[PDB]
Amino acid sequence: MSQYLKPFELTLRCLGPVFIGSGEKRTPYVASTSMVYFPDMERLYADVASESFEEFMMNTGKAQPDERFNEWIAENGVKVSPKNHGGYGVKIGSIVPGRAHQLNDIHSFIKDVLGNPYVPGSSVKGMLRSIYLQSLVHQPVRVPGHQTREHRQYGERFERKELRKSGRPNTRPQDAVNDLFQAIRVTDSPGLRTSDLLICQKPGTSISLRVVVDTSPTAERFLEPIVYLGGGAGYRSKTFVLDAQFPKIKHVAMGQCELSIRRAE
Amino acid sequence: DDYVKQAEQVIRGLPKKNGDFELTTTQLRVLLSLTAQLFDEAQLSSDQNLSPALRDKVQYLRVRFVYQAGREKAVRVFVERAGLLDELAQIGDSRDRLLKFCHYMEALVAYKKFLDPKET
Amino acid sequence: YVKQAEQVIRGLPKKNGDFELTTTQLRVLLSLTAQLFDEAQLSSDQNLSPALRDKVQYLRVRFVYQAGREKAVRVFVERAGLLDELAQIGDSRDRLLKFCHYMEALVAYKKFLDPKETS
Amino acid sequence: DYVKQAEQVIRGLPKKNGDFELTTTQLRVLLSLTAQLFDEAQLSSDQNLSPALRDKVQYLRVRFVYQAGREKAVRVFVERAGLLDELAQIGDSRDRLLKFCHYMEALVAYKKFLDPKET
Amino acid sequence: AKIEITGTITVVTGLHIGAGDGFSAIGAVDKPVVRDPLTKWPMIPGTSLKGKVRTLLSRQYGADTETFYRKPNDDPAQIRRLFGDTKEYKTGRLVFRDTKLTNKDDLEARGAKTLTEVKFENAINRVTAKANPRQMERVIPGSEFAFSLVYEVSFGTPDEEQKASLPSSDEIIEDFNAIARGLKLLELDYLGGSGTRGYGQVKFSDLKARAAVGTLDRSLLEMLNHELAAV
Amino acid sequence: TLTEVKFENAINRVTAKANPRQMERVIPGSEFAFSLVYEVSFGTPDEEQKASLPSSDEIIEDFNAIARGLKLLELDYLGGSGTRGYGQVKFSDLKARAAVGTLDRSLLEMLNHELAAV
């Protein structure tokens, strides 16, 4: 290796499910009792030599989702099944449901090119962005302000105070160049099998990752824990010490992971 | 052939109800980035009339627009105004329409961004 | 319209101490318009052959798409009036060249009022 | 005095590095075309311009200010000798045009002369 | 005297090498990726590939006690012996190439279609209760370029101050060790830039060597391959 | 557009500051024609060897010098921006041709044998 730089690793085992949004949505899928059939859309236009329901794919109106999109098409001469049409599926757990406030359209995790998912490297770099500034403030600084412009702003003006100390004689500290948090180098996780994410209304998967600590731009203690990030993670897991900004009355009175130091190589 | 002038007015046929847009450019990156990929090799074929290996390849671009039309109501009126799925029927005849269609399609992004801020 | 080039610089935002546009912002314009009218010189006939009446229409797609960028280009096209005479081009060769001769007179000036001090 | 006062400005531009920062190689595009202008300005019999040539003194005029901005020595040299103003009041006739083609000739020969300039 | 280093490069992560302005700039985001201008396939430029090897080697082959190597013309004379400077006017012995995509007729059969993807990212900036959108772009990690470079030795003299600055068969091995430790950290550092985001790791397969012109030592070019095959 | 604007950047490790650069190249499929003429090379000598006409055996050495002239040239550069990858070229369809002269039939087809050796 080099003298300013060593490799490092870390544990990442999730216990609750992991959902990172990516601006992608699934829409009428089969919402039935035992099968959620996610098929290949490329194969439904191979009997043209067709037009059973692929004219009604456009056609929707003032109707409720998951009414008739799956109880009509298989009763024709279509011969739809797994291993004969193809595709994949993540299946339902316990509830059907029948709650009041059925199962609506479902969000999307990030996948690589084939539906094979991964935890993002940017989030697991942003996970530790919620750690090293966040931990050792223990007076402990607050988030003082009445309006939404000055509720959360102390995550900004404190992030450039004791975190940008590379200290070149010709650049300011409080910008993109003089950071010391650019020491370790996160590598994004590889692609896994299909059924790892499960349907949630808001599980023991092994993920490893390479991080490479560096002491090049600095002119060893950086490396030195059951925090929850990767999905629905709450209101106090993003920064240090989110109800007052939205109008909610009670301000006046599922992603479990694990991290521990591991110096393997 | 003058459909670049058509994109000046068919963007104003978007139903903009708040005063603001509702079909912003951000929803379209699963549309406009996938028509570029067939375009780059469509020109690369020296033959005017296509091969059957190239007639079937536009069909995935067709059904993803009807997947988006079933997904979002904004795309459903985006198609049937400018007649995308209408021109995507005879696009399996020859590439000259397929060239003119994406040429039309590139013009649809233009006045859309002309009225959008686009600060990064 | 060479005197218009001195006139349009009297409206672009320079109050903050520096300038907004560069030649780098409108760089992709210059890879097209300079490529364009140097195919119009070798044209022997007056009316444009159809091989480049779409190429000037290729530009008109690009100019407003380039005008959809940050507010540095927002002042630039409308204070120049590029688009308002760019639709007029589609028939004859002559003012197509004077369209390019206008913007060549323009881009020789619009970043070139002291960009080294940025003033 | 236009054929001498090109000397106190060919002195007036400063070089402190030992060598003249305005190279004579810096003007081989302004002065390969101003020859081609001069070769047909004098062949013109009329006192006023030909209609095909008043654009030519304009087409040259932006190339002055374009190669002005592209460099830093030419950025100050041109307006200190004031070739923008002598080109501003030139569009009438060849009375001031052939003053210009010998004002630059007064300046290229001086800049050859006040340098070592091995060849 | 010329000896070409045959190879192949395979990416495993996203790669955002080179944005600028956009050669096409129609179907891409405001931060684009470079592409083969005839065919629009994401190439690799030979500049940053040289612009990484020179800047990885200002940490292991120097910068021992607070010496910045503050401009890379202050490199040690092994780096000048490979790359070159204005310090000795040498031609350089490390001629790269520009490497384009190769497996276009392979990636479509392995289930990938779009040839690049805009992975949406966040910028959680705590100011006025927002998560800032940003839309940087990656390339497909199943994509394989090609790889080649040639080493050349002027066996007469490559300089002027001495009548002999040539390398014989003794100097080549410290160069290949500088090829070994050159490409070493790049196998675990990002090939492109915009670091700390999981970018640009590549695995060189088949990194052999072919002698272009001349007669070489039979034992040498295969033990030189050890410093090639190690990284 | 027939000519790219390929960018670059400078980074000085005093402060890692970005300084751009643009190297406009040719399009990488731009094919050029390529001609050159050889001759029977009849000497006009300063030296005393007056009227020393090169025969085919002196000629057939030169086609190896044509071969190894361009064989390394395919391997090496042509243009500027040195040792960064620009200008890998591939000389194609090389053919000699007796345009004018009294060259025999056996010779010229063997003069093309060096041309394929690159």
PDB file of C-alpha atoms in Angstrom, chain A residues 89-229:
ATOM      1  CA  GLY A  89     -41.591 -12.071  -7.099  1.00  0.00           C
ATOM      2  CA  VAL A  90     -41.353 -10.973  -3.463  1.00  0.00           C
ATOM      3  CA  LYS A  91     -44.201 -12.519  -1.484  1.00  0.00           C
ATOM      4  CA  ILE A  92     -46.554 -11.218   1.201  1.00  0.00           C
ATOM      5  CA  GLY A  93     -46.076 -11.919   4.908  1.00  0.00           C
ATOM      6  CA  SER A  94     -48.878 -12.080   7.493  1.00  0.00           C
ATOM      7  CA  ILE A  95     -51.444  -9.290   7.025  1.00  0.00           C
ATOM      8  CA  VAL A  96     -53.729  -9.122   3.977  1.00  0.00           C
ATOM      9  CA  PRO A  97     -54.516  -6.154   5.148  1.00  0.00           C
ATOM     10  CA  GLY A  98     -57.849  -4.777   6.313  1.00  0.00           C
ATOM     11  CA  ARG A  99     -56.777  -1.737   8.292  1.00  0.00           C
ATOM     12  CA  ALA A 100     -58.371   1.699   8.221  1.00  0.00           C
ATOM     13  CA  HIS A 101     -56.760   5.127   8.559  1.00  0.00           C
ATOM     14  CA  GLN A 102     -55.941  -2.649   0.973  1.00  0.00           C
ATOM     15  CA  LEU A 103     -52.232  -2.656   0.105  1.00  0.00           C
ATOM     16  CA  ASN A 104     -51.501   0.162  -2.331  1.00  0.00           C
ATOM     17  CA  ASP A 105     -48.701   0.488  -4.899  1.00  0.00           C
ATOM     18  CA  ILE A 106     -45.195  -0.227  -3.641  1.00  0.00           C
ATOM     19  CA  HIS A 107     -41.980   1.830  -3.652  1.00  0.00           C
ATOM     20  CA  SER A 108     -38.624   0.790  -5.093  1.00  0.00           C
ATOM     21  CA  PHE A 109     -35.183  -0.050  -3.739  1.00  0.00           C
ATOM     22  CA  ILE A 110     -32.021   0.533  -5.760  1.00  0.00           C
ATOM     23  CA  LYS A 111     -30.878  -2.356  -7.952  1.00  0.00           C
ATOM     24  CA  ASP A 112     -27.853  -2.574 -10.189  1.00  0.00           C
ATOM     25  CA  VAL A 113     -28.788  -3.620 -13.780  1.00  0.00           C
ATOM     26  CA  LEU A 114     -30.712  -6.883 -13.303  1.00  0.00           C
ATOM     27  CA  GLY A 115     -32.915  -6.289 -10.285  1.00  0.00           C
ATOM     28  CA  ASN A 116     -30.025  -7.237  -8.000  1.00  0.00           C
ATOM     29  CA  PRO A 117     -30.070  -4.763  -5.091  1.00  0.00           C
ATOM     30  CA  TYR A 118     -27.422  -3.255  -2.832  1.00  0.00           C
ATOM     31  CA  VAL A 119     -27.137  -0.848   0.070  1.00  0.00           C
ATOM     32  CA  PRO A 120     -25.838   2.416  -1.450  1.00  0.00           C
ATOM     33  CA  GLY A 121     -22.300   3.555  -0.835  1.00  0.00           C
ATOM     34  CA  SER A 122     -23.472   7.153  -0.569  1.00  0.00           C
ATOM     35  CA  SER A 123     -25.858   6.328   2.279  1.00  0.00           C
ATOM     36  CA  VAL A 124     -23.269   4.276   4.171  1.00  0.00           C
ATOM     37  CA  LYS A 125     -20.977   7.265   3.749  1.00  0.00           C
ATOM     38  CA  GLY A 126     -23.873   9.412   4.940  1.00  0.00           C
ATOM     39  CA  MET A 127     -24.469   7.010   7.815  1.00  0.00           C
ATOM     40  CA  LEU A 128     -21.079   7.819   9.334  1.00  0.00           C
ATOM     41  CA  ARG A 129     -21.730  11.491   8.569  1.00  0.00           C
ATOM     42  CA  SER A 130     -24.392  11.087  11.282  1.00  0.00           C
ATOM     43  CA  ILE A 131     -21.859   9.569  13.699  1.00  0.00           C
ATOM     44  CA  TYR A 132     -18.537  11.312  14.293  1.00  0.00           C
ATOM     45  CA  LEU A 133     -19.898  14.834  14.610  1.00  0.00           C
ATOM     46  CA  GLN A 134     -22.963  13.444  16.348  1.00  0.00           C
ATOM     47  CA  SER A 135     -21.349  11.329  19.059  1.00  0.00           C
ATOM     48  CA  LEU A 136     -18.809  13.283  21.114  1.00  0.00           C
ATOM     49  CA  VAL A 137     -20.670  16.559  21.608  1.00  0.00           C
ATOM     50  CA  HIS A 138     -21.309  15.118  25.098  1.00  0.00           C
ATOM     51  CA  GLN A 139     -22.519  21.891  26.806  1.00  0.00           C
ATOM     52  CA  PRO A 140     -24.248  19.738  24.158  1.00  0.00           C
ATOM     53  CA  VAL A 141     -25.211  22.092  21.349  1.00  0.00           C
ATOM     54  CA  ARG A 142     -28.843  22.631  20.400  1.00  0.00           C
ATOM     55  CA  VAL A 143     -30.920  23.593  17.351  1.00  0.00           C
ATOM     56  CA  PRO A 144     -32.250  26.998  18.456  1.00  0.00           C
ATOM     57  CA  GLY A 145     -34.929  28.810  16.478  1.00  0.00           C
ATOM     58  CA  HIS A 146     -38.652  29.426  16.031  1.00  0.00           C
ATOM     59  CA  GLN A 147     -39.154  29.269  12.244  1.00  0.00           C
ATOM     60  CA  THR A 148     -38.248  26.456   9.838  1.00  0.00           C
ATOM     61  CA  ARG A 149     -35.404  28.572   8.393  1.00  0.00           C
ATOM     62  CA  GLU A 150     -33.724  28.498  11.821  1.00  0.00           C
ATOM     63  CA  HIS A 151     -34.857  25.211  13.365  1.00  0.00           C
ATOM     64  CA  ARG A 152     -32.415  22.845  11.678  1.00  0.00           C
ATOM     65  CA  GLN A 153     -29.654  25.268  10.616  1.00  0.00           C
ATOM     66  CA  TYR A 154     -27.183  24.282  13.346  1.00  0.00           C
ATOM     67  CA  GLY A 155     -26.403  21.130  11.376  1.00  0.00           C
ATOM     68  CA  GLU A 156     -24.916  23.439   8.740  1.00  0.00           C
ATOM     69  CA  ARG A 157     -22.880  26.040  10.639  1.00  0.00           C
ATOM     70  CA  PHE A 158     -21.433  23.458  13.032  1.00  0.00           C
ATOM     71  CA  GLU A 159     -20.448  21.028  10.249  1.00  0.00           C
ATOM     72  CA  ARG A 160     -17.666  23.378   9.072  1.00  0.00           C
ATOM     73  CA  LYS A 161     -16.310  24.332  12.514  1.00  0.00           C
ATOM     74  CA  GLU A 162     -14.344  21.326  13.848  1.00  0.00           C
ATOM     75  CA  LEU A 163     -14.529  19.157  10.716  1.00  0.00           C
ATOM     76  CA  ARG A 164     -12.602  21.126   8.049  1.00  0.00           C
ATOM     77  CA  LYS A 165      -9.060  21.358   9.441  1.00  0.00           C
ATOM     78  CA  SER A 166      -6.742  20.183   6.658  1.00  0.00           C
ATOM     79  CA  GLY A 167      -5.241  23.660   6.791  1.00  0.00           C
ATOM     80  CA  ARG A 168      -3.489  24.560   3.573  1.00  0.00           C
ATOM     81  CA  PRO A 169      -1.856  28.016   3.711  1.00  0.00           C
ATOM     82  CA  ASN A 170      -3.723  29.023   0.512  1.00  0.00           C
ATOM     83  CA  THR A 171      -7.412  27.939   0.787  1.00  0.00           C
ATOM     84  CA  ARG A 172     -10.115  28.712   3.363  1.00  0.00           C
ATOM     85  CA  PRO A 173     -11.200  25.939   5.768  1.00  0.00           C
ATOM     86  CA  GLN A 174     -14.968  26.337   5.413  1.00  0.00           C
ATOM     87  CA  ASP A 175     -15.402  24.845   1.930  1.00  0.00           C
ATOM     88  CA  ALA A 176     -14.926  21.652  -0.113  1.00  0.00           C
ATOM     89  CA  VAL A 177     -11.120  21.492  -0.064  1.00  0.00           C
ATOM     90  CA  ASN A 178      -9.955  21.525   3.567  1.00  0.00           C
ATOM     91  CA  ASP A 179     -12.059  18.583   4.778  1.00  0.00           C
ATOM     92  CA  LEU A 180     -10.564  15.925   7.042  1.00  0.00           C
ATOM     93  CA  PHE A 181     -13.657  13.698   6.721  1.00  0.00           C
ATOM     94  CA  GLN A 182     -12.361  12.692   3.259  1.00  0.00           C
ATOM     95  CA  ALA A 183      -9.963  10.249   4.960  1.00  0.00           C
ATOM     96  CA  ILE A 184     -11.833   6.974   4.519  1.00  0.00           C
ATOM     97  CA  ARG A 185     -13.011   5.898   1.058  1.00  0.00           C
ATOM     98  CA  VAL A 186     -16.336   4.037   0.957  1.00  0.00           C
ATOM     99  CA  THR A 187     -16.861   1.311  -1.640  1.00  0.00           C
ATOM    100  CA  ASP A 188     -20.433   0.524  -2.707  1.00  0.00           C
ATOM    101  CA  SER A 189     -21.937  -2.877  -1.870  1.00  0.00           C
ATOM    102  CA  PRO A 190     -22.376  -5.650  -4.484  1.00  0.00           C
ATOM    103  CA  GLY A 191     -25.586  -6.986  -5.997  1.00  0.00           C
ATOM    104  CA  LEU A 192     -27.592  -9.681  -4.208  1.00  0.00           C
ATOM    105  CA  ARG A 193     -30.446 -12.085  -4.941  1.00  0.00           C
ATOM    106  CA  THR A 194     -33.971 -10.926  -5.718  1.00  0.00           C
ATOM    107  CA  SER A 195     -36.103 -11.716  -2.655  1.00  0.00           C
ATOM    108  CA  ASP A 196     -33.950  -9.928  -0.039  1.00  0.00           C
ATOM    109  CA  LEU A 197     -36.255  -6.939   0.382  1.00  0.00           C
ATOM    110  CA  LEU A 198     -39.717  -7.826   1.698  1.00  0.00           C
ATOM    111  CA  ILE A 199     -43.028  -5.960   1.659  1.00  0.00           C
ATOM    112  CA  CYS A 200     -43.388  -3.597   4.611  1.00  0.00           C
ATOM    113  CA  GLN A 201     -46.073  -1.301   6.015  1.00  0.00           C
ATOM    114  CA  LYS A 202     -43.989   1.518   7.479  1.00  0.00           C
ATOM    115  CA  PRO A 203     -33.951  -9.290   7.997  1.00  0.00           C
ATOM    116  CA  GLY A 204     -30.582 -10.887   8.682  1.00  0.00           C
ATOM    117  CA  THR A 205     -28.611 -10.097   5.536  1.00  0.00           C
ATOM    118  CA  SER A 206     -24.813 -10.026   5.476  1.00  0.00           C
ATOM    119  CA  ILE A 207     -23.213  -6.982   3.818  1.00  0.00           C
ATOM    120  CA  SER A 208     -19.503  -6.183   3.929  1.00  0.00           C
ATOM    121  CA  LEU A 209     -17.758  -3.097   2.605  1.00  0.00           C
ATOM    122  CA  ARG A 210     -14.265  -1.696   2.070  1.00  0.00           C
ATOM    123  CA  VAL A 211     -13.230   1.662   3.543  1.00  0.00           C
ATOM    124  CA  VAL A 212      -9.720   3.006   2.927  1.00  0.00           C
ATOM    125  CA  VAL A 213      -8.432   5.541   5.478  1.00  0.00           C
ATOM    126  CA  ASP A 214      -6.073   8.179   4.038  1.00  0.00           C
ATOM    127  CA  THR A 215      -3.724  10.861   5.402  1.00  0.00           C
ATOM    128  CA  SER A 216      -2.840  12.676   2.150  1.00  0.00           C
ATOM    129  CA  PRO A 217      -4.740  16.038   2.198  1.00  0.00           C
ATOM    130  CA  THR A 218      -4.507  16.480   5.962  1.00  0.00           C
ATOM    131  CA  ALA A 219      -1.758  19.121   5.889  1.00  0.00           C
ATOM    132  CA  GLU A 220      -5.261   7.571  12.836  1.00  0.00           C
ATOM    133  CA  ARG A 221      -7.912   8.256  15.482  1.00  0.00           C
ATOM    134  CA  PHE A 222     -10.570   8.700  12.760  1.00  0.00           C
ATOM    135  CA  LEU A 223     -11.552   5.015  13.009  1.00  0.00           C
ATOM    136  CA  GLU A 224     -12.515   5.269  16.692  1.00  0.00           C
ATOM    137  CA  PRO A 225     -22.944   1.816  17.403  1.00  0.00           C
ATOM    138  CA  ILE A 226     -26.274   0.005  17.034  1.00  0.00           C
ATOM    139  CA  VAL A 227     -27.755   2.996  15.209  1.00  0.00           C
ATOM    140  CA  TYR A 228     -30.653   2.615  12.788  1.00  0.00           C
ATOM    141  CA  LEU A 229     -30.327   3.812   9.195  1.00  0.00           C
TER     142      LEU A 229
END
